[PDB]
Design a protein around this ligand. Structure first.
Ligand SMILES: Nc1ncnc2c1ncn2[C@@H]1O[C@H](COP(=O)(O)OP(=O)(O)O)[C@@H](O)[C@H]1O
Ligand SMILES: Nc1ncnc2c1ncn2[C@@H]1O[C@H](COP(=O)(O)OP(=O)(O)O)[C@@H](O)[C@H]1O
Lengths: 198, 195
């Protein structure tokens, strides 16, 4: 062990609310299912309620920490591994960490879970669940049309699998309710787990 | 995303935005772990949230797949540099304590911070090699001398002294407490820590 200030000591100074509330909210689901959106609205809820948080997504990860990674199966596995480890470092610093990666394979998700659990840090797996056709009609970034046209391969939902989370902590049905309803589902969980005040 | 500023408000009881990376560099045994801890403890006792990145929480996690080949050591520091930035972006004071022997790697670390408007402070934890070796804190020197670890900085690979670091800490000539103080002064001068 390296000698550091304890998690419980860190709990006094992080944010106003006392207590160690570090953890990772791990959003998973199809491209366009609603991860970036839910993550933004959660981040807003958290900041508005004075709970320090940080979001890892493609914007701060992919052209930095993971800029030396491409799309081979081994590289995508490394992608998620690195993400999971850093998320764990943010949980351990006492921040609420929100990740928003399609993270299709149970193996990688369950591995993310395991490193948090090993460290005694809460991990909430959140299935951001919409049907593929609905995601494909949103085509937020034009990836589906590129993937269909063969300009991208290995694109989850088209020529690689999304493996539905078996026991996620919440399922957000994003084609059947509002952003606000979906967020509220995550917020309730954080309440029930004492991360976020009533 | 919520503006960096707005995230800053809620990080601690102190106000504003105090995210930055404090980058210690120096020979093995010079004083990085000791300065870090004391500085970590100064920040906590002043209600400024901070986080330390060291061999312990990085080497068997994020960087578990990196050996001691030169390329791996370059990647080791690159990854660390990026994470520090994420912590400074998150609004925490991030303290790193890696022998970061090469100017190139260090300046690369600063650069990814400067691009993003994130203060970066290179601290030169400077003690002479002979003193570090008499210290032999974790027994690494006599092991390196004995052929068990190769490429050990100061022994069979170079340590490049920082040209223009923000503070120099002469850890053979003053106390831990006086050393931390040069850093804390820097932090106060630069509006990360209040007077
Ligand atoms: N309940 C909901 N949750 C999240 N997104 C929703 C919801 N209802 C509609 N949407 C819309 O679906 C799209 C989701 O895109 P995005 O959030 O970028 O997906 P991802 O981050 O998973 O790739 C957005 O335009 C969003 O406004
Ligand atoms: N001014 C000083 N700053 C830091 N350490 C000092 C100082 N004076 C004596 N020491 C001692 O030198 C040793 C440095 O070891 P350490 O901090 O573990 O080295 P590093 O972490 O840089 O490899 C510790 O025993 C520390 O107490």
């Amino acid at each position: 062990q390296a000698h550091h200030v304890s998690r419980n000591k860190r709990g006094q100074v992080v944010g106003t609310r006392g207590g160690f509330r570090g953890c990772t909210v791990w959003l998973t689901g199809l491209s366009g299912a609603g991860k970036t959106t839910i993550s933004f609205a959660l981040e807003e809820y958290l900041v508005s309620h004075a709970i320090p948080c940080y979001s890892l997504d493609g914007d701060n990860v992919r052209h930095g920490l993971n800029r030396n990674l491409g799309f081979s199966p081994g590289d995508r596995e490394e992608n998620i591994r690195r993400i999971a480890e850093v998320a764990k470092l943010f949980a351990d610093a006492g921040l609420v960490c929100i990740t928003s990666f399609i993270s299709p394979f149970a193996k990688d998700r369950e591995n993310a879970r395991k490193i948090h659990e090993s460290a005694g840090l809460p991990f909430f797996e959140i299935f951001v669940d919409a049907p593929l056709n609905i995601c494909e009609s949103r085509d937020v970034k034009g990836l589906y049309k590129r993937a269909r046209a063969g300009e991208i391969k290995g694109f989850t939902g088209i020529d690689s699998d999304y493996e539905k989370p078996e026991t996620p902590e919440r399922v957000l049905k994003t084609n059947l309710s509002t952003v606000s309803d979906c967020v509220h589902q995550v917020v309730e969980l954080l309440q029930e787990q004492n991360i976020v005040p009533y």
